[PDB]
Write a protein that binds this ligand. Sequence first.
Ligand SMILES: CC(C)(COP(=O)(O)OP(=O)(O)OC[C@H]1O[C@@H](n2cnc3c(N)ncnc32)[C@H](O)[C@@H]1OP(=O)(O)O)[C@@H](O)C(=O)NCCC(=O)NCCS
Lengths: 393, 310
Amino acid sequence: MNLQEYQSKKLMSDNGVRVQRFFVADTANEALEAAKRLNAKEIVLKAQILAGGRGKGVFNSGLKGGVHLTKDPNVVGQLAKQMIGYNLATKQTPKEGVKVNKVMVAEALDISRETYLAILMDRSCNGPVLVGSPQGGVDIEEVAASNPELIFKEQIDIFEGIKDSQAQRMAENLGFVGPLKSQAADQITKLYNLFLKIDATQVEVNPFGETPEGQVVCFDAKINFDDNAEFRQKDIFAMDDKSENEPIENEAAKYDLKYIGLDGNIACFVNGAGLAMATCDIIFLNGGKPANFLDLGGGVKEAQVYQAFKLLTADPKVEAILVNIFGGIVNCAIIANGITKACRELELKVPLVVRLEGTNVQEAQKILNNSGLPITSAIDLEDAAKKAVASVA
Amino acid sequence: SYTASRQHLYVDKNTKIICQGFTGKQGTFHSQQALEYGTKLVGGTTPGKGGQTHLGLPVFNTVKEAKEQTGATASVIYVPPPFAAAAINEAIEAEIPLVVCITEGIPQQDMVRVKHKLLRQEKTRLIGPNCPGVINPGECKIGIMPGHIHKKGRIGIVSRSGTLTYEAVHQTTQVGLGQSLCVGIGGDPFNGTDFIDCLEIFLNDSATEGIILIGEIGGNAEENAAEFLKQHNSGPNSKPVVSFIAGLTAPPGRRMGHAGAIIAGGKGGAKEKISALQSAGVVVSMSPAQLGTTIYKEFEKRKMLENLYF
Ligand SMILES: CC(C)(COP(=O)(O)OP(=O)(O)OC[C@H]1O[C@@H](n2cnc3c(N)ncnc32)[C@H](O)[C@@H]1OP(=O)(O)O)[C@@H](O)C(=O)NCCC(=O)NCCS
């Protein structure tokens, strides 16, 4: 799930982390009043959408630029009128754009210095780790490739928690001095407890910096949430804007189906995450272009199979289907009947390759060929891949 | 260290099993199959149902009682995500030698806590969570894998994937090689057993003449296993290792079903895993449908070499 910028920074502000002051306008008038209410020497105005590169985007109203600067609250009003309601296209959105419903009206703070700081559950280390760099404002990866000596890491013991010495040391290594060291050490702490409270897999502050007046401020940040912990982050996951995902993915979600859209024309659905990724690869590997990854999960139902077929048969890109199911200890004849049932009810009109495996594959390969529907069976995963790739040209 | 408990992966015909979540939908079902398979399932736990009888077997309130009353040496967990990490802890505390956690969805922070206590002892070996368990064909089966596709034999299989393991199993059964011990380490990013853990057992076991390592995107365990093979499976009398690494077409930034299967910040891609594996002597099967024929051909290549030089 993804938070809007205003949702994620409010989350941080409420937990002691310092961010730019801001308000959230639903209307051009709201943006004007907010700009007035800021006691800000300079205002920034930012379209609230999930995609990146909002900076150089375009609006149906004609406005170039999703993010704008001005000292004049009136300017905020005008520019907001050219955002709110209209649609923002970026190098991360379909040519349609995204409807902009809210804009952030924030104070713009000058940056004197820039560091990188993230808290992260590190698989290599078996616990939470602080990762900082005195070199901020650039992507962390390029920093590690060019100057690994400027990556500093502190492992935090998850029961003992973050100790003052750990925060002092990281602050020091990122080049904060004097009263800025105290602010930075304080803020590293508050960031870390924020990261445990909300069950984050990563909290990334870049730039983690200083204002000229002497203030440590997280100027921007990205939060990654553990999907597993949703049952105990009810209030946060409720903030999720499902309206910017591929709508197929959202409908799949409604049926415990794990779907992810690829740019291809051969649709596939499989029980098992890893086998679903393998089926994507083995399709491409035989020339093809897979339309999607879909994981039915462990259990195959006459009814879940229907919803999967319902999705794929509703996607305009899809010109073929490769189903590959391991029946395990269920009679694969009772799967192929779920498949012929759903394919007749859905009026299957694209060619479907089905690989089954498990008990009674013999009577199962028969129901599939005897179906009177555009269905052909396959002996193994190379067959299905090869046959499916042939079905389009 | 915790590595001492690696031997407990090699479940066998004397393994005696209890089921945590025994009276639940999946505990019940896969217990019936454990009994169909001939596995020494001997009892189970459900808080608040100690005393009941289930599948002709006793139900206990705590792992500690179950261990005392039955002599159990291994535990399998079908406990729902909010409580499963607590179940794992109870079994570490109960000092159960081998614990298999089938549960998907345990919070990562939970598993960091579980791992914290796990790594600080050596009586208990954890496989999982989010895995299908371990099977010694014909001798002992802990988890959800279908028994009937297996056949006792010579290939060790370790794998982050459940359904992909079945492919490997079926293929190595189809080519006639059989499996010595399969271990599904599951698809979570924080878990109790990596590839290296299974390789040390495979390498030290004589029943295991070949290894298949099935991996996927995310983390660095494939890369670590590549290094390990360089130190422990070089020189002569080395065992062939065929691997398949899934997710070559996976888009970055996305969880590909498994919570642990995601490329982020450029780390965790499939092709980095193939290079690193291939640099240790590992034969990567391009196609997931060819694990069996590739490990098979690998044995042929060694036989052709012996015929050539005599
Ligand atoms: C763990 C999982 C299987 C449970 O599903 P389920 O069996 O349908 O669940 P149930 O609702 O029957 O609950 C199981 C039992 O756990 C019991 N339980 C709860 N806490 C427990 C504990 N600490 N110890 C023991 N039992 C416990 C419950 O009381 C329930 O028994 P009851 O219904 O008789 O009271 C499910 O959450 C899951 O992980 N799904 C499958 C994931 C998967 O495929 N992973 C494999 C990766 S290859």
